[model samples]
Target: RKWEEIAERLREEFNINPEEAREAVEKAGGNEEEARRIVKKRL
Candidate 1:
């Protein structure tokens, strides 16, 4: 259920779909370094 919860968060926050959400939730299990970098890219 954690993946689902995280995927939902990704959808609400980043507007990604289930497929995209899974990727983001999967890859986003990283530190602040990757977080800011990814946010920067998405922004």
Candidate 2:
């Protein structure tokens, strides 16, 4: 399940919770380009 797999990766990479990770992954469609949209975790 790449969808779940990608979301799980996002969780650890961004230090986000399961809910936020899932939401971000889904909203970004799991594509690398879209994933960058979340890098603003800079704050």
Candidate 3:
């Protein structure tokens, strides 16, 4: 999935704003791939 998609899920699951969630993911030393990996990792 794309970074935007991961952002969407993060927003829904954690009540994180979409843009904020995207920024958080990026801040976490992750691009889209890592963002998706995060979701998979958590689940």
Q: By TM-score, who's the top model here?
A: 2
Computed on alpha carbons, the lDDT of every model, listed in order, comes to 0.54, 0.66, 0.60
- Where in model 2 is the C-alpha error above 4 Å? 39-43
Residue pairs with backbone atoms closer than 3 Å in model 2 (clashes): none
Q: Please, what are the lDDT tens digits per residue for candidate 2 over residues 1-43?
A: 3668767777667776677666666778877557657533555
lDDT of 2 at 7: 71
Model 1: CA > 4 A from native:
29-43
Model 3 lDDT on a 0 to 1 scale = 0.60
Off by over 4 Å in 3: 29-43
What TM value does model 1 have?
0.47
Model 1 has a clash total of 0
For the record, the alpha-carbon RMSD of candidate 3 to the native fold, in angstroms, is 5.9
Better by TM-score, candidate 2 or 1: 2
Candidate 3 at residue 19, lDDT? 63
Using lDDT as the measure, what is the rank order of every candidate, best first? 2, 3, 1
lDDT of 2: 0.66
Number of backbone-clashing residue pairs for each candidate, in the order shown: 0, 0, 0
